[PDB]
Symmetry: C2
Subunit: 133 residues, 2 copies
């Protein structure tokens, strides 16, 4: 497991201030350097290689909120690695999972979020994995 | 599942001709465009963004054969994505797994190899994955 991400450069994209604020607060308690944005256009100019992870809100109906992740893949396709994309939603049913895959999200968090679901995901995403067989 | 990788740009690095030859043959039957090399120095100059996957042999004792994967991570750290690294070994016990992780290998194949273990790995590596929670 992995309990703290002290120094983790992460970005939060959420149109809602409270949600954005809460999310930043949790990440800060875990030791993250959190940059926040509240619009897609803003997310695209701010997101840099500095950011190891981008948590984005996807609670709008359909895939309106997933487009930004595609736009984000386009951008880093400059020298540095594209950041890991994590979606923030009210569900994780097939609906959501399907969308994240086709749209490039690497992980998904169920809302409201807690240190608990945040650690697990950041741990999985950040920790070494090898597909044996 | 995923049965054919027609058009898959892959590279094979193996000092042994037969092993290198066999591996290329299997990948060609699956539809891959296989480039092969037989030395580390050679692997480093040939490996390009063209290559979506690099299968490398790691049967030397210790981690002598894993170094090339580190050297490969260094290189793409230019614009294009680093290729997925797959190790070819005679075992998959903890010994191997530990090494692949610390050295950046994304997957590992047990030798001798077969279309079977090749498909599974390429499928997992290549197919969309999302860490929900």
């Amino acid at each position: 497991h992995m309990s703290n991400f002290t120094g983790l450069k992460v970005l939060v994209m959420d149109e809602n201030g409270v949600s954005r604020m809460v999310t930043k607060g949790l990440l800060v308690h875990l030791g993250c350097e959190v940059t926040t944005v509240s619009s897609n256009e803003e997310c695209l100019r701010v997101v840099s290689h500095e950011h190891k992870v981008v948590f984005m809100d996807v609670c709008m109906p359909g895939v309106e909120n997933y487009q930004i992740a595609l736009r984000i893949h386009e951008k880093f396709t400059q020298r540095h690695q594209r950041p890991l994309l994590v979606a923030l939603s009210g569900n994780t049913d097939k609906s959501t999972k399907e969308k994240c895959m086709s749209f490039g999200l690497d992980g998904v968090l169920l809302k409201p979020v807690s240190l608990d679901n945040i650690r697990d995901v950041l741990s999985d995403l950040l920790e070494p994995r090898v597909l044996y067989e």
